[PDB]
From a paper:
Islet amyloid polypeptide (IAPP, or amylin) is a 37-residue peptide hormone that is cosecreted with insulin and one of the most amyloid-prone sequences known. Overproduction and aggregation of IAPP leads to amyloid deposition in the islets of Langerhans, a pathological hallmark of type-2 diabetes. Although the precise link between IAPP aggregation and disease remains uncertain, IAPP aggregates have been shown to be toxic in cell-based assays, and genetic and animal studies implicate islet amyloid in the progressive loss of pancreatic β-cell function. Amyloid fibrils have a similar cross-β architecture, but fibrils formed by a single protein sequence can have diverse structures, varying with time, self-assembly conditions, and sequence modifications.
Cryo-EM was performed on fibrils assembled from 30 μM IAPP in the same buffer used for kinetic assays (160 mM ammonium acetate, pH 7.4, 1% v/v DMSO), in the absence (4 replicates) or presence (2 replicates each) of 50 μM YX-I-1, canagliflozin, or doxazosin. Fibrils were imaged after 2 weeks, at which point fibril formation was at a steady state, as judged by analyzing aliquots with ThT. Following helical reconstruction, multiple distinct IAPP fibril polymorphs were resolved, revealing further detail on the apparent morphological differences between the samples. The majority of fibrils formed in the control (69%) and doxazosin-treated (72%) samples were classified into three related fibril structures (named LL, LLU, and LLUU, respectively), which have a shared structural core consisting of a pair of protofilaments related by a 21-screw symmetry. In addition, further flanking subunits presenting U-shaped IAPP subunit conformations and ambiguous β-strands were observed adhering to these two β-sheets, with the combinations of these flanking subunits differing to generate the three individual polymorphs LL, LLU, and LLUU. By contrast, the control and doxazosin-treated samples consisted of L-fold (62% or 72%, respectively), U-fold (34% or 28%), and S-fold (4% or 0%) subunits.
Numbering used by the authors:
A (entry chain B), B (entry chain D), C (entry chain F), D (entry chain H), E (entry chain J), F (entry chain L), ...: 15 to 37
The structure:
């Protein structure tokens, strides 16, 4: 018997930069 | 019997920079 | 019988820089 | 019988820089 | 029977720099 | 029977620098 | 007069997971 | 007068997963 | 007159997990 | 007149976990 | 006239965990 | 006239845990 509940009521602003690597 | 509840009511601002490595 | 409850009501500002390493 | 409750009502500002290592 | 309760009502400002090592 | 309660009502400012070692 | 030279002769294996956040 | 030279002679294996967030 | 030279001849293995935060 | 030279000839293994915070 | 030279010939193993904070 | 030379020929093992704070 497993129960997983996730409730979100809030504003979420996200910025993600992955890279910009010089080889 | 397992119960996992996560409730979020707050604003979340996130910035993530992964990289910028010179090799 | 396991119960895990996480409630968040507060603003969260986060900044994460992982990298900028010169090799 | 295990109970883990975490309630957060406060503003959280975080800054994390991991790196900037010269090899 | 184990109970772990953590309640936070206060502002938390954190700064973390891990690195800046010259090899 | 184990009970662990931690309540925080105070502002917490933290600064952590781990590194800056020349090898 | 600015000169930026980056030469890489070594194998580079990288894994990056950004996310897996429950709101 | 600006000169930017990047030469790469090495194998580069990369894996990037951005996401898997439950809202 | 500025000169920045970075030469890498060594194997580099990196793993980065940013996230896994429950709100 | 500025000269910055970084030469790396050694294997570098790194693991970085930033997060896993419960709010 | 400024000269900064960093030469690394040794294996470097690093582990960094930043977080795991309960609020 | 400034000269900064850092040469490393030795194995370096490091472990860093920053956090695990209950608020």
């Amino acid at each position: 018997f497993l129960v997983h509940s996730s409730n979100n009521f809030g504003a979420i602003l996200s910025s993600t930069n992955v890279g910009s690597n010089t080889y």
